[PDB]
Amino acid sequence: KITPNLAEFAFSLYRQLAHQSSTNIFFSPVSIATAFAMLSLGTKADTHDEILEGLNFNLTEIPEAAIHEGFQELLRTLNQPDSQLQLTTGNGLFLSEGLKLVDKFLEDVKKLYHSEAFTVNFGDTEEAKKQINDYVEKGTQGKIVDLVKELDRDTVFALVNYIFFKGKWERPFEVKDTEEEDFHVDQVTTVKVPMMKRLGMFNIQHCKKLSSWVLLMKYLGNATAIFFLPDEGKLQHLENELTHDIITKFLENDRRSASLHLPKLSITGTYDLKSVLGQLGITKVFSNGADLSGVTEEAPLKLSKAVHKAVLTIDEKGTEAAGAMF
């Protein structure tokens, strides 16, 4: 019910990150989305709508009551892997010892977002940092270590979120076949990279709309990887031409014999989503005009920053990836 909203949010946000850098890009749409969608619960007025809307939601059409209701089922579902697939997502709410929350807020995040709550003392910025970093490290099974490196001393509450994924190729690569090959960055810049190779039947097809070759690798379980290889001088095009449905089509497909060369990857993205998210309309919550009444009636609050870190590993066995929002 909200899959399309996310799909498009992913693209919206992506196009922003692609414009801002040239560097490898990697992020977790689901992660960033549920983290903010969750925050909105304790946000009001514009600061509220501003968030929800930036996540590609039309408040008029789909009511927030149903938006949150949707994130609830999307989360419940992402947490019941096909046994052969490891997929987990956790939302934690760290509150400062001396804080008078707003009951409803705690019941909501805990109910709609399956959130956990803990009481740390941000006065001890080293211990508070230790608790959070630990939560994230545990959830992302070691993939994302010290997420928080600089925590404000006056911090009232931190809304952490993490996502973990580990799957095996439904048709893996043999390690003996992986050799070191060329990878063309520029039209005059080539770097050597350990290239994975495998000959066989693939779900590869050339979508004309995107002017790229679309390859689909299934994971043993309930997950699929989609690789888009743009035709000479058409990457910029591919990126701009992506839409939810287009991605829905490829999945309905056939198969074909081919010799595939896929490089094994080890890349990680780290982001200060304030600049990018503002570009999507989300600015209020980051300003001295942000309204976080829904969290605490105490003093007025605002976000000092929005850090996101994702880490990807792609080898012959399969793929492992973690994402964390702080």
Partner: protein, 42 residues
């Protein structure tokens, strides 16, 4: 052993900047997404 003619399949090589995303088959939602511009870049 009986040998028959083969077919020489075509090579599909992602040795240039490409895009990609990860989808959960049920919800069909985008778990992850990204672009590989230079696998050696850290």
């Amino acid at each position: 052993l009986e040998a028959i003619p083969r077919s020489i399949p075509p090579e599909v090589k992602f040795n240039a900047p490409f895009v990609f995303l990860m989808i959960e088959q049920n919800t069909k939602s985008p778990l992850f997404m990204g672009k590989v511009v230079n696998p050696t870049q850290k």
